[PDB]
Amino acid sequence: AGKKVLIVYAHQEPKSFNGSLKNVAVDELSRQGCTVTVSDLYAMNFEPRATDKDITGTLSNPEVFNYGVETHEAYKQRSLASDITDEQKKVREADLVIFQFPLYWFSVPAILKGWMDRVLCQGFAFDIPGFYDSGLLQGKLALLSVTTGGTAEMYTKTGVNGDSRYFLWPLQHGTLHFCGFKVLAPQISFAPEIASEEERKGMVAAWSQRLQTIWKEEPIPCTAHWHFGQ
Amino acid sequence: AGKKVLIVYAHQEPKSFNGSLKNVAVDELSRQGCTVTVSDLYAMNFEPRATDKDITGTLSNPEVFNYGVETHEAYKQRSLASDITDEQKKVREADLVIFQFPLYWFSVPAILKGWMDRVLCQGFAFDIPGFYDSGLLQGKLALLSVTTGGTAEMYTKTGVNGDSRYFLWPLQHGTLHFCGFKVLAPQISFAPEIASEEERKGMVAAWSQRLQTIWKEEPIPCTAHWHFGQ
């Protein structure tokens, strides 16, 4: 049995280091015989804002608009904007979801943050109760492939930016694990802009290389100890 | 000599708890004689996406688009889109910047992440020469006023969501502190949707009561130790 992979990509320039990491993922997974799909957010001019335009049906409460309540209800009724449902179908069938993006303020670019806000709604990605290990997307794997401006050294406990794992918390635990995803070790390609030609090729080669045996990997213990140690 | 306050508000509903917190801040700071300005992102339909449209005229390299460089260059060349510059002016004149928003996936809603991504560009909020304690916005104060779905109990080091200080790291340290901001202790209104009307009032009152002496408050030590340590 093969596998389906969804790459949610967030970069404006195809020739970027991110674009290369993305194309590398596509080529390698495609070579393995895997089914691959890419959601190129910027090329899709993907809507990041969570507004009442995401609901098409009669609102549960037209007097006071509550995004969470309205999208939860719209999901069950099937009155969500189609751009949201198109993404949910991709995630639903996916066995692995890779996020390829440059770090923006210790997080994901707003266009990708919007994807997370609008696509992972209650009813589809999780339920109350029905989160974390009970998240609705349980059984699926997720992986963050991040590029940075800061060097590995800066991203250390005693470094100026602190350990890289610190900023992964909101994404891996607060979002992915919350929805039931098993999180694979993140792929951080440190400061490609500062790196030399050979170092950049090595970073890219390491990515595709790791992808060759990605199906053999085990997820990380997405806990506070893993991220912070303490 | 009077103070200037900018409130970056991120909520779709005026009758919301977030809306009330913002209105209470405007009322209290206005009563004190403070100069107050509010950036209602949703009402402004603020653009969250970082694209080449953020640069006016012609790009310094229309071959390969590098947002960071193009915006840095555009800033120094006074060629940024007006929505961006309108915000920077409010920021530059402000003595205190309050962010009022509901917690979305352990972070800010995408529309607000976009504000941070696009408004705090290189040359304005920071530069290789000066960052963090030497950020270009040094001297100014920043304060996060966030509302959550989860309860205070859930937000403890041994709780399901972990300690709230954990998700503050990317925002307070990675973003605000990085730009020279002195960070005031966050204002977190835990689960207002769960709490009772009396408890909700208590929360809003603590906020307004706190605003009475915010100018007397001392900045928190934005350190890895403060967020993660004991």
Ligand SMILES: Cc1cc2nc3c(=O)[nH]c(=O)nc-3n(C[C@H](O)[C@H](O)[C@H](O)COP(=O)(O)OP(=O)(O)OC[C@H]3O[C@@H](n4cnc5c(N)ncnc54)[C@H](O)[C@@H]3O)c2cc1C
């Ligand atoms: C709003 C904003 C916020 C930011 N916040 C943060 C933050 O909080 N923390 C942080 O650390 N950084 C931050 N950054 C910096 C950001 O993370 C980096 O600029 C980004 O990750 C670099 O990745 P890239 O793909 O854009 O690089 P590129 O500039 O595209 O790549 C660098 C070089 O790679 C070359 N290249 C491309 N493909 C290949 C290939 N296959 N082989 C060899 N070379 C190749 C390119 O041609 C180029 O010369 C921020 C940037 C912005 C704009």
Ligand SMILES: Cc1cc2nc3c(=O)[nH]c(=O)nc-3n(C[C@H](O)[C@H](O)[C@H](O)COP(=O)(O)OP(=O)(O)OC[C@H]3O[C@@H](n4cnc5c(N)ncnc54)[C@H](O)[C@@H]3O)c2cc1C
């Ligand atoms: C996409 C998305 C992602 C999310 N991610 C997270 C997450 O990672 N972690 C987390 O903990 N939560 C998360 N949440 C939940 C979110 O943080 C809460 O729903 C939100 O903070 C509630 O604030 P509110 O202003 O919307 O509440 P409201 O529903 O507007 O307020 C609750 C009650 O307050 C009443 N009220 C209004 N004004 C007043 C007043 N002046 N005095 C007294 N009562 C008043 C209202 O009328 C209402 O009945 C997420 C929600 C969404 C939609």
Ligand SMILES: NCCc1ccc(O)c(O)c1
């Ligand atoms: N319908 C939004 C309610 C909600 C509460 C907690 C979360 O972690 C989350 O992603 C969403």
Ligand SMILES: NCCc1ccc(O)c(O)c1
């Ligand atoms: N010119 C972007 C480089 C950069 C590096 C680290 C940051 O924290 C940041 O905001 C921006």
Ligand SMILES: [Zn+2]
């Ligand atoms: Zn976790």
Ligand SMILES: [Zn+2]
């Ligand atoms: Zn700090």
